[PDB]
Amino acid sequence: SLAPEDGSHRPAAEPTPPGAQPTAPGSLKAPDTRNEKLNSLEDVRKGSENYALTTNQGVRIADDQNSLRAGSRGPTLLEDFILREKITHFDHERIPERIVHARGSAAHGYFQPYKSLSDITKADFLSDPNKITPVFVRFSTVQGGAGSADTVRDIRGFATKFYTEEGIFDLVGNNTPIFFIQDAHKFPDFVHAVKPEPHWAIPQGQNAHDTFWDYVSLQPETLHNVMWAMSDRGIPRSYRTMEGFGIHTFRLINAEGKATFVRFHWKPLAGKASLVWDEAQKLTGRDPDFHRRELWEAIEAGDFPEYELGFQLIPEEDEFKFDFDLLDPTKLIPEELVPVQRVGKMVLNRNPDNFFAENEQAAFHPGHIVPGLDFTNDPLLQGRLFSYTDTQISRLGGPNFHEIPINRPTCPYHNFQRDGMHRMGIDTNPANYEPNSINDNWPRETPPGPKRGGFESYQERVEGNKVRERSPSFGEYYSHPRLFWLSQTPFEQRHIVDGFSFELSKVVRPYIRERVVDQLAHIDLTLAQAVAKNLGIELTDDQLNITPPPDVNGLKKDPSLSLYAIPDGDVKGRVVAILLNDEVRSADLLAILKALKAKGVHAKLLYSRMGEVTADDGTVLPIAATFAGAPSLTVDAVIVPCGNIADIADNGDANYYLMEAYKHLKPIALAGDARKFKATIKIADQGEEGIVEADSADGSFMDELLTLMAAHRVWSRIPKIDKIPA
Amino acid sequence: SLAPEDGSHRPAAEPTPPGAQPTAPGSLKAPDTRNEKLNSLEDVRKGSENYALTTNQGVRIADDQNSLRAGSRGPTLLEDFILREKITHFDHERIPERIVHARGSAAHGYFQPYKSLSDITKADFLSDPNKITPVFVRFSTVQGGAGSADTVRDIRGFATKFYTEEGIFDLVGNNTPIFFIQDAHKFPDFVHAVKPEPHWAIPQGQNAHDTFWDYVSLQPETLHNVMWAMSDRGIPRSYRTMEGFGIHTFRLINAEGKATFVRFHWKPLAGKASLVWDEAQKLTGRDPDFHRRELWEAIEAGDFPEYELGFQLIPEEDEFKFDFDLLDPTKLIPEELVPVQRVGKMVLNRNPDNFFAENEQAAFHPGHIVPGLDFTNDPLLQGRLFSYTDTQISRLGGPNFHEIPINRPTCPYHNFQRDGMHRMGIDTNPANYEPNSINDNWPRETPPGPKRGGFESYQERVEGNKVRERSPSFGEYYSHPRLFWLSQTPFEQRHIVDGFSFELSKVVRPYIRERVVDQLAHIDLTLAQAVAKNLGIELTDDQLNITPPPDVNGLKKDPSLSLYAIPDGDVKGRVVAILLNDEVRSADLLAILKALKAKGVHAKLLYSRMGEVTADDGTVLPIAATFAGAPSLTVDAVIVPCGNIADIADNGDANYYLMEAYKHLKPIALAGDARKFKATIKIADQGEEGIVEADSADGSFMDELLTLMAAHRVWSRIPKIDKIPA
Numbered sequence A, B: 001s002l003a004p005e006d007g008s009h010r011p012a013a014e015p016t017p018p019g020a021q022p023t024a025p026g027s028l029k030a031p032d033t034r035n036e037k038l039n040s041l042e043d044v045r046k047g048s049e050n051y052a053l054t055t056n057q058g059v060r061i062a063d064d065q066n067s068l069r070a071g072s073r074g075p076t077l078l079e080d081f082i083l084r085e086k087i088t089h090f091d092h093e094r095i096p097e098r099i100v101h102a103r104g105s106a107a108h109g110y111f112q113p114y115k116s117l118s119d120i121t122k123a124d125f126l127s128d129p130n131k132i133t134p135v136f137v138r139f140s141t142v143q144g145g146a147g148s149a150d151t152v153r154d155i156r157g158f159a160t161k162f163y164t165e166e167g168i169f170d171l172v173g174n175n176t177p178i179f180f181i182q183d184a185h186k187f188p189d190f191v192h193a194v195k196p197e198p199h200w201a202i203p204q205g206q207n208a209h210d211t212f213w214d215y216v217s218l219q220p221e222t223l224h225n226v227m228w229a230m231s232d233r234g235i236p237r238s239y240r241t242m243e244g245f246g247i248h249t250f251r252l253i254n255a256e257g258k259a260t261f262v263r264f265h266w267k268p269l270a271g272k273a274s275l276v277w278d279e280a281q282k283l284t285g286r287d288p289d290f291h292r293r294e295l296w297e298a299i300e301a302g303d304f305p306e307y308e309l310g311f312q313l314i315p316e317e318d319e320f321k322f323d324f325d326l327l328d329p330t331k332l333i334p335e336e337l338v339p340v341q342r343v344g345k346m347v348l349n350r351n352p353d354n355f356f357a358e359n360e361q362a363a364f365h366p367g368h369i370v371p372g373l374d375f376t377n378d379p380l381l382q383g384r385l386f387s388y389t390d391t392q393i394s395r396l397g398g399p400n401f402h403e404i405p406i407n408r409p410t411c412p413y414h415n416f417q418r419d420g421m422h423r424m425g426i427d428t429n430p431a432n433y434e435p436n437s438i439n440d441n442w443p444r445e446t447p448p449g450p451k452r453g454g455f456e457s458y459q460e461r462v463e464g465n466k467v468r469e470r471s472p473s474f475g476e477y478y479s480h481p482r483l484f485w486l487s488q489t490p491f492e493q494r495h496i497v498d499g500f501s502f503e504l505s506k507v508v509r510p511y512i513r514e515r516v517v518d519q520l521a522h523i524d525l526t527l528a529q530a531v532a533k534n535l536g537i538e539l540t541d542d543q544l545n546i547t548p549p550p551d552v553n554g555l556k557k558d559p560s561l562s563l564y565a566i567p568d569g570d571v572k573g574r575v576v577a578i579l580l581n582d583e584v585r586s587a588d589l590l591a592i593l594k595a596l597k598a599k600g601v602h603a604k605l606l607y608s609r610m611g612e613v614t615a616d617d618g619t620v621l622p623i624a625a626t627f628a629g630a631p632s633l634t635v636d637a638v639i640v641p642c643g644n645i646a647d648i649a650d651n652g653d654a655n656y657y658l659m660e661a662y663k664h665l666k667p668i669a670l671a672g673d674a675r676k677f678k679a680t681i682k683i684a685d686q687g688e689e690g691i692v693e694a695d696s697a698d699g700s701f702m703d704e705l706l707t708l709m710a711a712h713r714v715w716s717r718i719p720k721i722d723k724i725p726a
């Protein structure tokens, strides 16, 4: 036996906080969590304990340490079938990554609606508040490869597979409410532009290069989503703290055949929260798997990601009531004009067992709809419907990708389709066609109906010539970017300016930067001037005189577009670094941890080495990480208790830890002699908002810190940070 | 026309320093760089200027902006073949990445021997110093995906495809002289252990995780390459500044049929140089494409990567003369015992045109040898021979991957093989079998001979039973790690310690850390105690009393194992950050740029914003990047000219710039009022070795600076950096 005697190789099969236990496969970690999809994957789950090592043919292997050779220093023999099976399988492990959104992290969960929506849709998964629908959700970036970093600036994908009783419904969204382009025909162009440039394949995971800004400068329709991407929306703190949107207008179809237009929304119940750019960038180097890790660990801890499904609903007769086209995917529907009606709740409560088998192989496709939904003519949606079926033929090896376990419906599926690579189902039907008499025409078509009926498209009127033409109604590019800008707080505006300025600095051809600044002058002259200035560009007289675009249906702002305008902080599942010394004051530590535990906030105990330290009273404190190994990038706040402060006062790493957290606007709390650390970050004797300080770590020292954490970052600190060399 | 009037979209077709011009495909950048292989690709290069946009079938496209739809707001029509072709090709762009070494960067060049080697090898490419062999070289990391970061801690791959007159020879090596494991049967185990863990696919590009150290702790044969990976060898400054090795003993065979044992080496003519860990890790976040960028830009600048090919030659009668087995790929041959004969030089002088077509699709395989070379019984080599043919069947789509342009021989190739997916050659031979009379038996076998002859294996004697058994002569695991350890400088020793300490700190299961510490105590107690101390572990008495392993054939060190013991700095191609201010002392800048130019050292002008600044004498200085956009991580030294130092004196980014560079041991030079920056980095009034300072930037100031740059980093500074919060 290689396992240790004390059984410490095996993670506890119960919820534990991040870092307490090694992470494990979801069905070993949380064996008691179940839903109908997880249950149905049981036939393909393979265990391992107490089984013999075999070939794939079931032959027991005696020596898995050597090749077969003629003499123990001799040549390897071709007859070594155990070696060749094992190397062959290794040699063919990889499958193509997704063309876009290659980088992504996934979890199982469930959805339930709040009430029946049968008055507006016959969709079965929305028919009954008791009806629970298993889900599999994959979150992702867009641009980078599967091995790229999580906390890049990019759009995020938020893809949900609902395993309904009437088929698979995939809701394939992003974390911003619009897309960059209007017609699918341009997708390979846009994607080629944002992707690594084709001569040298640089840069990975970054829009900060010439071809992307070239495209944008020439295609003003992209400016709306670019504004989002340049805002702090482009750097979420967690997949748990971002919004999701279906982007397109789709249709709900009720049992009377009435169509209602709908846009889909996901509201994060843990609230909205983003990083700051310098933090996000550095974090791609300190922990390129930060969001993937954070997601897995939240679930293992029982901080399950929760989201609320919502619908913006527009009657058919209201199609033309707005200043923009409902079918234009570069246009959002302001919540001030059409509120989001709450629909149901989704909880992600189980990690996969095998990342490749469940996550890498999952195929999501927005054409996968169910009776009670239908499409519209949104010409970007329209082209999507072709792609997500097509791409699976190479990515997943052929037309039986629905038989890969994670993709299988849990409801019945029967039809006359046969064969194809790696065909699993063995059909016993004497007929493989219809109509047939030799099996009495089974499986049979089902008329549409109120429930359990066949799919019928809504009979929308089509009238016009066969044209490759953009609708004139789509030809307005600035008003939405402007509404977005005006809806942001002043610090969010600063961050947008600085996103454009940093990205444009990396564009080598100066005329591209100028053409982008010219485009910004059409959206807002304040934004345009602030960017221009950071680039050494002066606006012309002409540019200074560009009339701003009209407001959107009378709105001069919509605060639902801002991350922070309306506080919606949740501290549960956030993390605090506690910087230890070799003689910690235990009364400080007890108080800190007790207050954190009460609010569901985790802690990591840091020191200059691993092992343990002993507190003043003899208490042994296990160290999670070093200052350098778990940098401030990875936590939401930092607390330093009293003790032997001299032990760390001249530690570069410990000082720097505070400077980095200070710069990135995080709450910092210092107790007793840990107040000495005020010098390092240049805090006045009388203190400042965002630095909590006191003789000892209570009375209200933890309440104040916890209040700063609910506000996420100390925005008021922003003018103070250019000073600090961090 | 969309290009700018002044033609600044197009980079000059002449060598230019990094950042001076946009980078370009190699045949547009260096159209007159030719070699036989590059010329032979001309049939497949496709241009673009002045051609009409078409489908793949050659049909001109009128509107590449719109799908075809029934009405300009109507549905997309299935008959849109233009859209579907474009989206189909997009949907299938990706191919499986390499199972290992997926991340890599490649260039064209040539090789030429220094003298005829026909005394020891009939290999045609080694027959005449005037024989020029085109080459294609791909450098890589090992663990991470195609999308992961360059400056990770990893082994690096160094693969060279020689397009010889008698066949392709691929020399498929790494940047350390041994591998982790003895027998190819264990390669899937080792690789699964090092790769992201299967439940959650974390971590990317890092050995710093439980499963890797689990394997290492249980397989002491790994310890030798583990030591190299934990040293600064695991973090090269550049693919130009690392060694390459074939690892295995192979054979040269001469025209008389005499076999000589050979190990291959590549010696970098730019010298050996590595980053420090904190810089490397941070650089994976600031520029994950840094090595790829730096290789491409060196070649565009004319800093061609050059390497000397070297052979360690051991006569057949000397097979058993050492105290390790020549066929054990975890053992190196110390150059103190068998010197490296320098045999030729390879120059990398042209970048690819298309990364995907030339780099991603390149197939290298060590079984691709030519008459004059042969294999040995090394059980790791033996197993590789199977893998590199097998893996291309999925990765490159079939058995015709040799017809992919970058992979084609430039010499004749004719045989009876036919068909296979994407067969390009159209065979006219009446026969597809031999022996045949219908084509008079052509193409025909060729007897082996001194030149242009067929391949015959060296008739090595085999005697032994069919066994799966490790040779007992491979059962020694510690003496090579020890020799490597003892051969490092004191500062390289500290970085090895820090390497294990950092990595093991991230292993969650503490017993794994302990088991690894125990292994180190079988190598060297000093090492084992220093790593234990960082982990909060105490060695027992038993561990304190483990006898060290014996010397290697009497050697207690070999300075050729160190990166830095023997000075071999070359500053050509290195880069310095010059930090600007809004009134630069122009006389300082003239002197600096002049001295750098003379040594081939590049410069990047940095400021708080883009655009320009104007010098005291009115010279207009273009800014390359901001302090934040081109961090000190990306440069070899920092110089700060005099001028209006007040302008940057209080800029946090400029201050941090100097702190970061100082912490990573880089030379810093400060002229006139720039010396006010001594305060940010805590430098005593009467100066410190590694900080160049003077009233102005005279001739002596630049010589001192360039002398430091030749020593790569200021190792004496290491005790000062603990103090610095950066």
Ligand code: HDD
Residues within 6 Å of the ligand: A098, A099, A100, A101, A104, A138, A139, A140, A156, A157, A158, A159, A172, A173, A174, A178, A179, A183, A184, A187, A246, A247, A248, A329, A362, A363, A364, A380, A381, A383, A384, A387, A388, A389, A391, A392, B087, B091
């Ligand atoms: C016409 C092509 C096309 C266009 C216009 C879009 N996409 Fe897409 N998308 C794909 C073609 C595609 C794809 C090529 O089919 C992918 C890559 C691999 C795959 O399975 O689907 C994909 C993947 C993909 C994923 C990852 C699903 C997963 O995690 O596996 C998400 C979240 C989206 N897309 C979301 C969007 C949104 C919100 C869009 C605009 C509203 C959008 N896509 C436009």
Ligand code: HDD
Residues within 6 Å of the ligand: A087, A091, B098, B099, B100, B101, B104, B138, B139, B140, B156, B157, B158, B159, B172, B173, B174, B178, B179, B183, B184, B187, B246, B247, B248, B329, B362, B363, B364, B380, B383, B384, B387, B388, B389, B391, B392, B395
């Ligand atoms: C038994 C399997 C096996 C073993 C023991 C090794 N490798 Fe390997 N290697 C592969 C199987 C393989 C592979 C699966 O066939 C790869 C992956 C993709 C490809 O085309 O070849 C590969 C790729 C690969 C590459 C990248 C080539 C390129 O850039 O495309 C390098 C540099 C090496 N290997 C070097 C080594 C060295 C120096 C080894 C030990 C001395 C070694 N490999 C052991």
